[PDB]
Every structure is written in C-alpha cells, then in structure tokens.
Design a protein around this ligand. Structure first.
Ligand SMILES: OC[C@H]1O[C@@H](O[C@H]2[C@H](O)[C@@H](O)[C@@H](O)O[C@@H]2CO)[C@H](O)[C@@H](O)[C@H]1O
Ligand SMILES: OC[C@H]1O[C@@H](O)[C@H](O)[C@@H](O)[C@@H]1O
Ligand SMILES: [Ca+2]
Ligand SMILES: [Mg+2]
Length: 758
C-alpha cells in the first residue's frame, strides 16, 4: 500500500523562477512525474500555495522548466465568505494528495497520472451548502535563480521573445500555448506545445494577460475531475483529446489503474521486507525516482525511456544514455519490466544501420546520448545528441535480466540481433590489433578529427594553446615532451566511452599530480596516451582506438558474450551460441593472462605496445597509472579465476586502497591521480560500488560485501533523509555530489536493498 510511504522525497515547493536551480544548476525542487508524462507537479508548501499543486514543471523536449508557481489553485467561497482552510499535503508512490479542512467545507485533492501526457486531479468536495469555487493561476515571469537567489533580473519573455505564452479558455477549462523556442541548452518547444486543463463540470474562465480566474458553482458535496496535459506537438494535442474525454467520462477507471499499477510496483519491487524501515524507504525512493525519470515516446525517441534525472540540468527531457539504460533496465526489470524493456528498445532504436547517412562505417554502433532532437548532423537541432562514443557493453546483461523476470522469449528474439550487431561493431571498430580484445576509443567525428581524417589535439605550454592534427604529428610531439599538457578530444571520448569521464587510466592527471608522480621517480611518459586509427582494408577510417585494452570493457564483453550464448541457445541457434562461448573463453584467458598483475594483485588496462609480449598479450598492465574500479570488473563479470579474484578482493578491502569511509570509489587512494572531489578519480558511485559487491559475492566474498553495504548505508550522507538521490559520494567524508534524482543511483540503491541491505 502506497499510503505507508508518505513524503519519501520532499516534493514541496513554490517555484518563483523558470530555472529555479540549486547550486549545480538542477531544478531545486522534485516534482511528481508518472506514466512517462512530460509534466510534473509539486506539493504546496504553505498558505500561499494551498488549494493547488504549484510549480507546474514542463519537460520542454530536453530540459525541465517551471511554467507557473500557482496554477489552477482552488479557493472556495461560501455565501461570500472565503473559506479559511487547514492544509495537509503529502506525496505517496504514484500520487500527490492534499486535504483542505474547514468547519463546514472540506476538499481532498488527489493527483495521479492517467496517460503518457495527462495527469488527473480528483477534487472531492464535502459541503452542506452550495459553494462558489474559484481557481486562479499565473505564469512565471522571472527566469533564473540559484538557491532562491536571482542570477539576473532577466525575465522569461525577455530571454525568449518567441515564447510568447498565452492562456486561452475552452468549453471545459483552459490551455496555455507556447511559441517556438529553439534554445539549445535551455528551452525547446515545437511552437505547437500546450498545457491543457479540462474539467468534469462547466467553469467560467476569465483571462487577464498571464493569469486566469475560473469560476464554478456546485450545489453541495461533489467530486470534480481535472486533467492536466503537457502536449508537445499538434499531433499530441489532437490525439490526447479523446483520452481526456474518456478520463473525465470514467475517471475511476484511471485512478484505479494508477492505484493498481503502483501497488504492483511496490509489491513486486519490495522483496526484502526484513530490511530496516529506512532501507525500505530508500527502495521506495528509488522506485519513485526511476519511475519519475521515465519518459514516454517523444520526438526522435519512439519508445518509453528513462533518463538519468528529470530534474537534472543536462539529464532531463528524454535524454537517454546506453550504460545508464542497461543499469536502469536491470533494476526496473524487477518492478516495472514493461518500461525496462522500453528503455532498452529506446537505446537500440538508434543503433547505426547499414547505409546510415552519417556514419555507415559504424554499423551496430549504439549512440551515447539520444534525445528528442537529432543533432545537426542528422537534420535536427539538438546540442545533446552524441555519437562521439558509445558506452560499455552491459546490454545483453540488461536484456537477460528482463528475460529472467518476464520469461518472454519474444523479448530475447527481438533483442538478440541488436546485441549481436553491437558486439560486432566493437570488434570491427574498436580492435586495432585484431586480437579480439577491444579498446575504448572515438568515432570518426568533427570533435575528433579534421574532415581529411587527421586526429585533433591541442598542445599547451604556459599560456600558449596550439591546436594541431595528425597522429604522426601527435607521436612526434609526445616523444619530444615540449609541452605542459595536451588536450585530446579522442582521449576525452575514449574516457566517455568507458563511462568514467577523465579517469586516471586514460591518462587524465592534474599538473600537480603529474609533477609529484615524476618527482617520486615516475616517468612523465607513463601517463602519455597513444592512439591508432582503425581503418578497413579499403582505407575507410572506422575511428580511433586508444592503444590500450581496458579490463572493464573486456570483462563486460566477456559476460555479454555469455548472455548472447544463452540467448542463442534459447532461440535454437546452437552454432552461434558455440561461437559466443568460445569468444567469451578467449576473452577470459586474455583478461587473466594479460590484464592481471599478480604483483600488485589487481587488474589493469594493458597497453597495445609496439610488439606484443611473448605470451601474446598486446602489452604490460598499466600498473603505474594506479588502481581503479575497472580492477574488479573481471569479478563482477565472472571472467576472473578464483585465485585472481581472491587477490583483487584483498585489495578492495584494503583501507589504503579502496576501503574508505564510503568504500570502493573510482580510484584507489594510492592512485597518483586520485581526488576525493573528482568524479571518476575517487568519488564513489553506487554502480561501481554495487559491481564490486556483486563481484565479491560471485567469488565467495558475500560476507565481506554485506559489511561494505552496511558501511555504505551508515556513511553515505543523506541516504535516510528525504532529499533526492544523487550520483556519487566523497569517499573520505561521504558528502553527496552530482545530479539529484539520479537514475542509476536509484537503480543500484534498489539492487543493494534487494541484494545487500540487511
Ligand atoms: O555529452 C556526452 C557526455 O555527457 C557527459 O555528461 C554530461 C556531463 O556530466 C555534464 O557536466 C555536461 O557536460 O553535460 C553532459 C551531458 O551532455 C557524460 O559524462 C559523458 O560520459 C558523455 O556521455
Ligand atoms: O548518467 C549520465 C552520465 O553522467 C555522467 O556524469 C557520467 O560520467 C556518465 O558515465 C553517465 O553516463
Ligand atoms: Ca585489441
Ligand atoms: Mg521477516
């Protein structure tokens, strides 16, 4: 029952600005979203907002933007006396509720979602006498603030002259229309988008500029219904009208469908009732978060999907990442498999096909970031769409988990060839030395190379920045050492392809950290990253590889290969299943032979050296760049031998390595490029944390994993409070950072609830 989990996240707030941002530019409030809808609602915070759900949050294609503070707020009049109500407002999973109580009149307002575009408000009025109902609303004026404090005195209309917001009135309520705004990083509307209000009774709505007042008279106790719809195109507007009429014709049907759908999420999802109440509350927060971040089909993304955070400054709209998705779907398989499936379909719906106009050399490539708007390269105007890189291979894992739950063979038959094609891309475009062990790298892309296909790089000495191109020129520069630093877009993308932006093993290290490394006897050239172009025998530039095979991706391709094998078996494709088992086995041999360092007792990426080693390995483990979470990837993925795993686990548990106040961060404390404030060189992310716990368990160390899980639960800050879930933690102090309502934190906090919280 949803009513046991009230106010799991604080969803109160009265937005005063379109961008009512917190310190890191995320909307500092947490609206309720559901059914994949494109608008959200907040609870009133007091007297000023009661009678309404303030802060209509709109998802304007790729961003979250508030529309109004008070919109369709009820005040009730009884024979010319304004009823002074007492307020009680709360959220539960799948609803907002507010109760207005006075002596003679009471109102109970219940807000759920009814469709992918429409929320449904039940306004249940109890009264002896007839009443006069007044609803009011007012569009926001001010643009931007941080922590409530204005960033400028700019207005919404000033900044977006074509936004030109107008309220109109309909034969059963009212609508806000919006002009076309193509503000790449802020606000994207089609010019046909609307916010529609329809009601089950006639109302008399008057409009004065950017506010309205609607009136109605009722003869006494009655239940009213209101729909709120953010409709983003004309096609959506037309298509939704019959939905709205069915909703208002049979509102009970939709309330019950929301009630039931949510009972089902909690029933399916809450499988560890022995968890502490606060742990259980964390799982519910996670479920609320993941479902809040679910977006129904929109623009270029023709499937339901889940973004990393609906309130996130760069994560909102339907902006979708692959490895985020794999993790999200894996978790969501257990309580909302329908959308788990969709999320995965959404990512693969933009897998590169033969004959692709932009990058035919990348067949099977899965884009890093898809969203409502295609990039200019594909005829859209989206600034977020990204095909510089993909993310790591956790896709078959995610698909198999959905299959584990649903036992739906049609799912496996649907996903198998997409997974095959993805596997095939890695081996074709990310395996420079042809040894079947992939590298991270970078696509042919305007961020990475010149039109003529020469790799870009920038040399910096003092205040001189010197932009250049060509791998051979890059090689000569690197050897000579006549620079302070280098910025290499293909290096950035390779690190983005691992998902661990700026991680040490990809050669990312601060000036002062590198100096100290060299002073301690290290060679500066130990951190130099090398690259090679991957060309088809016909000359075609397929992309760039770091001259480096990464242990995480090898390990992920390992398990991915096993899941392909199981799917092949399920689909009666015994030869293909054979091939994938043998490929897996080869990878495991290479992981253990090449990537394991028995001396430091850890796994590392290897260099592709100029000559392969005598054992066939492309190069030595890159021990000198330090230890990271990629070191237990072989364990999470089952590639490791027991002895290698035993060794890795001692390192994981070591306080001078990864056994920190919040343990298992993204670089060990001994990593020369460590920083507690650095996302992927020290901060603790819940995915990597959980992958380590799973790795440990798989090789017999579940008891130790439980204690790390307990330590994490006691130390990771804000976990038992009512704040939104964020992305990562300071390993030393446990302070939270990163986007609020962060999906894969929710996914993995949920899996921890399921797998490791006791
Ligand atoms: O754009 C592709 C990359 O996006 C990065 O994510 C955010 C980044 O965290 C944020 O600070 C800002 O730069 O916008 C980006 C989203 O467009 C990912 O971190 C990176 O791995 C790529 O996916
Ligand atoms: O959640 C979306 C993205 O957020 C970034 O901060 C992380 O570095 C990426 O690995 C992730 O894919
Ligand atoms: Ca290789
Ligand atoms: Mg019990």
């Amino acid at each position: 029952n949803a009513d046991n989990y009230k106010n799991v996240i604080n969803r109160t707030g009265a937005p005063q600005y379109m961008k009512d941002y917190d310190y890191d530019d995320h909307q500092r409030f947490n609206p309720f979203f559901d059914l994949g809808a494109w608008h959200g609602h907040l609870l009133p915070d007091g007297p000023n907002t009661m009678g309404g759900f303030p802060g209509v949050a709109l998802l304007t294609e790729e961003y979250i933007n508030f529309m109004a503070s008070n919109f369709d707020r009820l005040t009730v009049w009884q024979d010319g006396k304004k009823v002074d109500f007492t307020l009680e407002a709360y959220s539960i999973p799948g609803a907002l509720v507010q109760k207005l109580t006075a002596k003679d009149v009471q109102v109970e307002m219940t807000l759920r979602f009814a469709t992918p575009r429409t929320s449904l408000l039940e306004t249940k009025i109890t009264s002896n006498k007839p009443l006069d109902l007044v609803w009011d609303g007012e569009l926001l004026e001010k643009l931007e603030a941080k922590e409530g404090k204005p960033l400028s005195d700019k207005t919404i209309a000033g900044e977006y002259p074509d936004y030109q917001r107008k309220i109109s009135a309909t034969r059963d309520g009212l609508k806000v229309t919006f002009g076309k705004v193509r503000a790449t990083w802020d606000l994207l509307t089609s010019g046909e988008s609307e916010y529609q209000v329809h009601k089950s009774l006639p109302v008399q709505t008057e409009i004065n500029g950017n506010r309205f007042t609607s009136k109605a008279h009722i003869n006494g106790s009655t239940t009213l219904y209101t729909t709120y719809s953010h409709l983003l195109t004309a096609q959506e507007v037309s298509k939704e009208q019959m939905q709205i009429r069915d909703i208002l014709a049979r509102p009970a049907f939709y309330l019950t469908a929301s009630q039931q759908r949510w009972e089902e999420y909690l029933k399916k999802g809450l499988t560890n009732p022995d968890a502490t109440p606060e742990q259980t509350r964390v799982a519910v927060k996670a479920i609320e978060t993941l479902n809040g971040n679910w977006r129904s089909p929109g623009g270029a993304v023709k499937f339901n999907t889940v973004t990393p955070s609906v309130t996130g400054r760069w994560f909102s709209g339907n902006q979708t990442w692959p490895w985020d998705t794999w993790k999200q779907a894996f978790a969501m398989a257990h309580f909302n498999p329908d959308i788990a499936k969709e999320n995965i379909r959404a990512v693969f719906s933009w897998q590169i096909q033969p004959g692709d106009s932009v990058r035919p050399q990348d067949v099977g490539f899965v884009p890093d970031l898809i969203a409502w708007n295609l990039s200019p390269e594909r005829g859209g105007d989206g600034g977020n769409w990204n095909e510089r890189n993909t993310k790591p291979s956790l896709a078959a894992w995610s698909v198999m988990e959905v299959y584990n739950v649903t036992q739906d063979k049609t799912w496996v038959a649907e996903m198998y060839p997409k997974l095959v094609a993805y596997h095939d891309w890695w081996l074709r475009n990310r395996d420079h030395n042809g040894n079947g062990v992939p590298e991270y790298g970078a696509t042919r892309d305007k961020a990475h190379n010149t039109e003529s296909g020469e790799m870009l790089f920038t040399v910096k000495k003092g205040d001189k920045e010197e932009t250049q191109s060509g791998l051979n020129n890059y090689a000569r520069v690197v050897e000579k050492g006549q620079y302070d630093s280098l910025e290499i877009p293909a290096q950035v993308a390779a690190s983005w392809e691992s998902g661990r932006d700026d991680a040490a093993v990809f050669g990312f290290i601060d000036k002062e950290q590198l100096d100290k490394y060299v002073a301690n006897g290290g060679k500066r050239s130990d951190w130099t990253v090398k690259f090679a172009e991957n060309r088809s025998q016909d000359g075609t530039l397929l992309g760039y590889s770091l001259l480096q095979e990464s242990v995480d991706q090898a390990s992920y391709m390992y398990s991915d290969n096993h899941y392909l094998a199981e799917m092949a078996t399920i689909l009666g494709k015994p030869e293909e299943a054979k091939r994938y088992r043998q490929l897996a086995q080869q990878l495991a041999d290479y992981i253990n032979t090449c990537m394991f360092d028995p001396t430091t007792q850890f796994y590392y990426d290897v260099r592709i050296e100029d000559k392969p080693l005598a054992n066939g390995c492309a190069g030595k483990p890159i021990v000198e760049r330090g230890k990271g979470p990629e070191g237990w990837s072989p364990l999470f993925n089952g590639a490791a031998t027991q002895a290698n795993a035993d060794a890795v686990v001692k390192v994981m548990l070591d306080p001078k390595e990864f056994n920190t106040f919040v343990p298992l961060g993204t670089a060990a404390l001994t990593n020369p490029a460590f920083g507690a404030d650095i996302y992927w060189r020290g901060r603790v992310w819940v995915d990597q944390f959980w992958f380590g716990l799973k790795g440990m368990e798989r090789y017999g160390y579940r008891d130790d994993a439980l204690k790390l899980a307990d330590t994490f639960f006691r130390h990771a800050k804000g976990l038992t409070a009512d704040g939104p879930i964020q992305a990562n933690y300071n390993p030393l102090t446990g302070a939270q950072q990163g986007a609020p309502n962060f999906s894969w934190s929710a996914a993995h906090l949920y899996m921890l609830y399921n797998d490791f919280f006791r």
